[PDB]
Design a protein around this ligand. Sequence first.
Ligand SMILES: Nc1ncnc2c1ncn2[C@@H]1O[C@H](COP(=O)(O)OP(=O)(O)O)[C@@H](O)[C@H]1O
Ligand SMILES: Nc1ncnc2c1ncn2[C@@H]1O[C@H](COP(=O)(O)OP(=O)(O)O)[C@@H](O)[C@H]1O
Ligand SMILES: [Mg+2]
Ligand SMILES: [Mg+2]
Ligand SMILES: [Mg+2]
Ligand SMILES: [Mg+2]
Lengths: 692, 692
Amino acid sequence: DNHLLIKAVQNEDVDLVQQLLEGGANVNFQEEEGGWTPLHNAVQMSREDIVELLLRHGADPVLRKKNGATPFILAAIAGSVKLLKLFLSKGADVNECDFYGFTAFMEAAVYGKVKALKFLYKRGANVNLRRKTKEDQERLRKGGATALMDAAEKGHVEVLKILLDEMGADVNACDNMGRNALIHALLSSDDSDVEAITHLLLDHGADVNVRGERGKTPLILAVEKKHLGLVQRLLEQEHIEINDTDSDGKTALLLAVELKLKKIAELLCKRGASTDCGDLVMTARRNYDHSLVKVLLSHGAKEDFHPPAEDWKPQSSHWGAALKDLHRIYRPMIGKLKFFIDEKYKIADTSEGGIYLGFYEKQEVAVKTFCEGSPRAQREVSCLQSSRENSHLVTFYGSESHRGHLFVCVTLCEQTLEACLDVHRGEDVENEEDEFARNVLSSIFKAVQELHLSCGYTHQDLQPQNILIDSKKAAHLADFDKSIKWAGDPQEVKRDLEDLGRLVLYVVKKGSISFEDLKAQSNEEVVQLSPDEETKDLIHRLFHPGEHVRDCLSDLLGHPFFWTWESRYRTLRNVGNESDIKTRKSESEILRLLQPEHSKSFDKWTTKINECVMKKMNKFYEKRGNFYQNTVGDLLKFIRNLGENIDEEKHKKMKLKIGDPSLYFQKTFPDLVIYVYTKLQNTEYRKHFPQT
Amino acid sequence: DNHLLIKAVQNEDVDLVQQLLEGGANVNFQEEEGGWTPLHNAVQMSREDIVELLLRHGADPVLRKKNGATPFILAAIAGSVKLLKLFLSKGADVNECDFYGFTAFMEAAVYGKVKALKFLYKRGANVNLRRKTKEDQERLRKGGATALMDAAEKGHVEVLKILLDEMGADVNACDNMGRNALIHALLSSDDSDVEAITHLLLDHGADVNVRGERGKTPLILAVEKKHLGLVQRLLEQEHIEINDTDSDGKTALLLAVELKLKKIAELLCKRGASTDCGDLVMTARRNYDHSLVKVLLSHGAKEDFHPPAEDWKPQSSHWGAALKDLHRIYRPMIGKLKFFIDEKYKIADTSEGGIYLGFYEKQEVAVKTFCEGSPRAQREVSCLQSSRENSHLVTFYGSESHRGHLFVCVTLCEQTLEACLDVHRGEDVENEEDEFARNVLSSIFKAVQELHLSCGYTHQDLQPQNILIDSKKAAHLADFDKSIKWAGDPQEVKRDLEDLGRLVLYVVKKGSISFEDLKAQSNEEVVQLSPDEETKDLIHRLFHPGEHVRDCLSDLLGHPFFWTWESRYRTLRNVGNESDIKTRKSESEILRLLQPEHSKSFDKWTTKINECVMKKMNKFYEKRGNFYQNTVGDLLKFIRNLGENIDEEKHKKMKLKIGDPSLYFQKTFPDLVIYVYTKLQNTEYRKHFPQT
Ligand SMILES: Nc1ncnc2c1ncn2[C@@H]1O[C@H](COP(=O)(O)OP(=O)(O)O)[C@@H](O)[C@H]1O
Ligand SMILES: Nc1ncnc2c1ncn2[C@@H]1O[C@H](COP(=O)(O)OP(=O)(O)O)[C@@H](O)[C@H]1O
Ligand SMILES: [Mg+2]
Ligand SMILES: [Mg+2]
Ligand SMILES: [Mg+2]
Ligand SMILES: [Mg+2]
């Protein structure tokens, strides 16, 4: 309803425009996006009749839009001398500029409007103004361009002749980047008139030895354009610096050779380019150009190139032998990525290619290949792009496309979970505490947690092959080409969770059971298959999360499974250290909680004990006859008591008969650690639990 | 010494070659890089005399190099009919191919050798072979190309005529990517003869409706080439699909409009392209092309474009109000980055521009700007590239270059450390435990640690402004444009360390002291300035690391400073629970360690206590008269004793008079926690310490 007038002007519906304005429409309304008024639109369309009509209804002739452009400036873009004349009589100044420093003279040059350019010059426009813009952009070295530069960049030949021959434009003016008009023409993608423009500028004394945005000289730009005529004209300049190098340290000749340009490369050689630019001869051979090889040799090129003394050692131990080779051999670069699809550097075969060693930004990485369009390709990439903040995932370095082939670069690891615990299974013939199982599973839990909640994705392929191991040896989640977005559907989250539970049994059993048949048996057989009670209750919780399935992963990180043996020990002694349990009380809140489940390990625990240690502990209460009884409370009283004095110096006898105390109590009563946890799980008696 | 013969051949020094071969030189030597033999080099140079000479000295005529190429195949690349004839008589098969599936016929087409092509055809070469390569590349959809495709891609016009008119080549053959010869010519960067090639193929019945590597049709490719003639010829095909979209969903007309091609866009419109491709009219207006606007309107283009219903909420709370706007408004894309250098989206000014809001891969990020060449630009980028595995650093999304301006994209945070603890200072009027100080400093310590040791860089600008805070509120390290590589020079590592110590005082004091004058006073005044003893000893260690300065950051993570109050409490009670300390022993190893330092807090601690609580505790030993004495051991005995019974149910009197026990003991004796740590720092009595 507020846009009616702007839209009427835009449709050039004069009758409707008249009707709206006479109806009471806001003539100076500004649309939110760019601050455009009906007048701005009328001028842009170069419709002087609509402009007049709007002005007579009280349109502000000098009202700027958001970029600071005036109707006068827009008139130059349109090329309307009539509208320029009009606004100059309405208070516009000929040298006024927008917030980016664009004057009307510049816009006429940009858009190639000759009549407007000529008119503005005679109305007193300044030809050699360098664009002044915000201090913001100026620190970037933005701004500083001129009208001559604009006409060059856009390739307006007639405008350029007029600027140089009739209007006294400074040919060698430079912007804040240091670019002159010659550089601007050669940088431009509008190549249509670049030959004429170049000759024109050079004949007017334009400087050939001036740098662009990447060390690029005019000569280097002509070489990269593969333009023989440009190179020929540029090389006629008696003082051109042929041996200048861009930001990559590459010279014009080297670039000519790499770009397979024999005629240009030979020309540079005849005009006296040095042949110590880099791998000159060997590059020509690799491109199978002996004609170019012979030319380079006669002009004195070196015959064995030893690259700069780059200090480099591979970080990987498993690879690295291969990495040293890949680092040494020649390879064409794909963007930032250097790699070779070859059996020597393949680490694994995959559905759309394989995984390969590579260097992403001089950094050693693993490279996953895809057919660029495939569903797998864009499931992996889409997931990796949305999960950069996930610390437990394999970190995403970047990707490169080549010819419909996607190369996803990713942190390089040593081996999979399978390969790792194959070795760990052969050495751990002991009944030893499995620290590795804990800090690997806790690491993977955090990956799936942030994946679901922070990244908003579901993995859908939790398996040992997809968990990679550092050289440290930390664990990381990987392979995402089977990921799905919205976790809203609980069946997808459930699918990931009951894959996690089957994975918990895998690591604890040290991989003796293959993951493929672990997925074959039900999630009820897998629970009954778990060795200790701590994993038994852990994977059971993963198969039956509470009302909020969301919270049910942070909670599990505080499960007895993740507790060390000393931690299980310390807290059992801490609960047994309750005053209500030593002075057994009927009304105790803690004692009624611990009361039962007919089948348990500790129902009559005083018989389960040795019991020569038992009688030696019972002697402490022989006076009042307060012996230990078969309650859950007195077992914890016993554990707190035993572990306390077992450090004193009259108890070496008890040390031998019990062995490690934290280990012994768990053996004879495996049911205990989980039982006390399930009970006190939501009480004030949780301070006894260890921190995380 | 083994390369003499290869080098002699490469120099075309026949006399030297003769001399070497007659001397006993290995005629079939293969250089390590590519498996090149003297024969391979002789053929590549197309020197039949050297080839003969080598063969007469026993050169294997069919020995392949590493890519599987034979001397026969190399002869086709050279275009030598004589050498092809020679090797065919020496056992080479006309249809033999390298390991990538290249035949001699194909190479002659690739390199445009007409005499060789004609010769090979008459010697029975198969014209229509599709390249067979390794199963590796084939899963990528590599391979499958033909000789016709090669000649098209390289732009050999005469070769193409011969293949189609004289040799019966399948014009509509497709490779494993689905590309035919027409698509290959239009994809090529060798545009020199693309007009002639296109007409030739189309006249021979080439299919126009076939997809390239990015959904690109021949028509879309011609439009992107800005080639009016190509578009004209392609549009003469009576059944071309004008409305096909590439992988971005962009049609040929839309691309023509975005590329500012009025004549092409009008042609597509006249040939009946639909005008519901996207933001057609509005794109033409933004480019100030009313002529194109009028054309699009007459052909029925929509006048208000509402983008697809992309569900999106900003993640940030501080920003996000601005992010919603930046997400909504139009902006030209710089690579992957969408952002606006404008005051509304600026978050901070900097030396070479500022920091701005932006979207890197549809992901909200902070954008840091640089002049691309500057030392600051390549100090930031070089550091960020080498530290992607650092979890505690600000994560590096990527960078885009535009016109000599570098835009470094990086994870977006809420505020700096200063801005955060300004608010925390106004609310924490309590003598409360500062949890925030701990988990922020421990997080920053880990950043500097991995920076120095894992990333191999020194920060050189540790300050509150450079520590950013999450919305969670986690801490992250940032700003790297003052980083230096090799940490070998200890003065650079020291400089970072004594910046860390001054930072520890900053956070603990809640930022009441500005960081700038903290750097003004000496690192000896800063130590004496620290409030509690735990920070006093912490920043002192940072100013005087041991022999190995390297280890001296992991060690500090186990300092009492990082211990919670309960943790300081628990371990003091644990040490006091030693049997040697309750039954005070002369020969005790622990008791002699704890013995002194004339000035301390606990020298005569029994007077420092209340002492109504003291006398109530001394009543426990009134029988044998074993009262507490002013040793360090009995103080810990007291702490272990008090904290033990203070939970029992006859001690509410002691709870009031002491308050929080973990807090009270630290008040009256601030010296204690650090003293016991310094003592037991390297003993078996470290089990009492808390884990990490
Ligand atoms: N970053 C890496 N470091 C080491 N090995 C890797 C890496 N990425 C993949 N691999 C290896 O490649 C195999 C397959 O890669 P993956 O991403 O699982 O592909 P797919 O989706 O076909 O399973 C993995 O099982 C693993 O052995
Ligand atoms: N990722 C980010 N999130 C939020 N704020 C940022 C981020 N990066 C930089 N800033 C803000 O910009 C300021 C300057 O950026 P910085 O990288 O320190 O540049 P300089 O090298 O000029 O100090 C910082 O103090 C901080 O306030
Ligand atoms: Mg997999
Ligand atoms: Mg997969
Ligand atoms: Mg800074
Ligand atoms: Mg800085």
